[PDB]
Symmetry: D2
Amino acid sequence: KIIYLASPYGFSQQQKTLLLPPIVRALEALGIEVWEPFARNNQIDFSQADWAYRVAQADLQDVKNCDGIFAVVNGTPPDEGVMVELGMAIALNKAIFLFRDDFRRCSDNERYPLNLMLFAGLPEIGWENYYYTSVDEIQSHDKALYKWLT
Amino acid sequence: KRKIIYLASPYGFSQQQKTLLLPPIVRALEALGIEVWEPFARNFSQADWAYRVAQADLQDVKNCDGIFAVVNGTPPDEGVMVELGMAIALNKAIFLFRDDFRRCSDNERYPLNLMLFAGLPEIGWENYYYTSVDEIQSHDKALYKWLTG
Amino acid sequence: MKRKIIYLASPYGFSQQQKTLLLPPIVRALEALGIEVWEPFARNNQIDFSQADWAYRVAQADLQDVKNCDGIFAVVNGTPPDEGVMVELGMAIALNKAIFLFRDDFRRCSDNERYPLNLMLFAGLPEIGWENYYYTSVDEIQSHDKALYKWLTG
Amino acid sequence: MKRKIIYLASPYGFSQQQKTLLLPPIVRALEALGIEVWEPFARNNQIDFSQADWAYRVAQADLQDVKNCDGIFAVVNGTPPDEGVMVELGMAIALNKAIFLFRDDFRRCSDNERYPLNLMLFAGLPEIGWENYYYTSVDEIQSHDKALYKWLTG
Ligand SMILES: *[C@H]1O[C@H](CO)[C@@H](O)[C@H]1O
Ligand SMILES: *[C@H]1O[C@H](CO)[C@@H](O)[C@H]1O
Ligand SMILES: *[C@H]1O[C@H](CO)[C@@H](O)[C@H]1O
Ligand SMILES: *[C@H]1O[C@H](CO)[C@@H](O)[C@H]1O
Ligand SMILES: [Zn+2]
Ligand SMILES: [Zn+2]
Ligand SMILES: [Zn+2]
Ligand SMILES: [Zn+2]
């Protein structure tokens, strides 16, 4: 099972080094094969003008070929690149999992923590089971990633 | 039969912006003969109202012929980005609008995050990229060419 | 009899349409109170991506305007509010200028439940009655019951 | 070298994983220089979506810390930089405080070709040599020929 790991964390040197590996490892510990686009497609700096299109199509192909997206949606607002990747995944009926350990709210509605469009690929009732608020919660057996694999 | 454009924007969140910014954009698009689906105009005390709105706009994106995405702001609005991502995966026509002179980018080719342009051609993507309301009418940009050619 | 000076901090000058359509109605609503409005994009001529030769002078001119104003009227629309406006608002707090905030955007971008935005934005406002300094529509600017009018006539 | 007080403004206390993993190495880097670090999340206890009757005290405590510090070390990562950091940075500029910026985020969020961010962030810096106060990595906080080090002496 393949999870595309969409995040803004590859943009900060400290975040790329410290925040992503514990997330990657939590997902692998479930049995998941993890596609992390920043390393997988080598976007390590302000992309040169002649490599940007290639980087874009590579990330696009991974979203089309994965089985689920694990979208890190921290920030005010969530990262625009993550959001494009999230909309692709929804449109392609891929499995959808959201991660937000940022306690700030950035929402246009009183029902969801974020803009209601991010949850358009999640059920009306138990969308909370797909919404992870802590790295240590990724392992949880009562949450939709585990049940997705079992 | 008019081509259908879904007009994604954050302009419905501000009272003044909804009233003053969106009508001129709609008019410019309609002057091209387009049928405009503007989600704020298309749209309350219920519990499931947010879910129903998400499903309603999702249906509209699925059924449009193209998206015209207002990508002003730093960064572009996350709801527009989700809708733009849907439109790219569903092979809809893609047009971007930004009259904001600020750059919010991860690369030197594009003035925005490169994934916003992933559904556009490698060369000539500028022809789909509108930088002023006055430019929407241009017979030399992709919207007119797509309506005719 | 010198008019009171309001510095109108906003991100609206970055967008051609916003600059042309959103700012003049706000300027008028303030001028209708007898206020002299300092709108930095027009005053200090930041009309496109500033050339390198010029960005320092734009910064110092806006900075000096904040120093010389009597109050700041901060457009704090957006998720999150604009970083330039926020710098100009922090300056105005520190310099004991009058503070008024404008947000007609109904989205919330906050780190707390007491205030609709980041808590620091209200650090220069009283603990009780801060809502009086927080405007949520251009039409509300005129309110003889809100803080801007009371500051002018007080 | 003198034991100056640095206010470490950042958005990193908002995320559980960032508060735990990203702040301590930055605090330790500043403390390796002999600086007294005032980190507002720990020091004024903002740990979650703040309770309404506590929010005003948090704002006033962070404001007082900015008033009583010697300089600000502003984490200005993100698109755009955090509005709370930006308010606290505007205060520091107007309060005559030493100004140090850092960003290891390689994205651009700018209104000008001279600076990688909104030009107002760099207003309290000099026209020539602002790069001195701009740290793009954590190994660079150490460096004796940047701004922090030199300020700690003269
Ligand atoms: C998908 O595209 C973006 C550019 O690499 C990146 O953020 C990834 O999430
Ligand atoms: C699609 O974008 C709109 C504004 O962000 C929102 O309604 C979403 O449905
Ligand atoms: C201060 O106000 C504006 C908001 O970004 C900015 O241009 C500066 O000129
Ligand atoms: C000052 O810094 C923090 C970052 O936003 C803000 O919440 C306030 O504590
Ligand atoms: Zn939002
Ligand atoms: Zn960006
Ligand atoms: Zn915020
Ligand atoms: Zn910016």
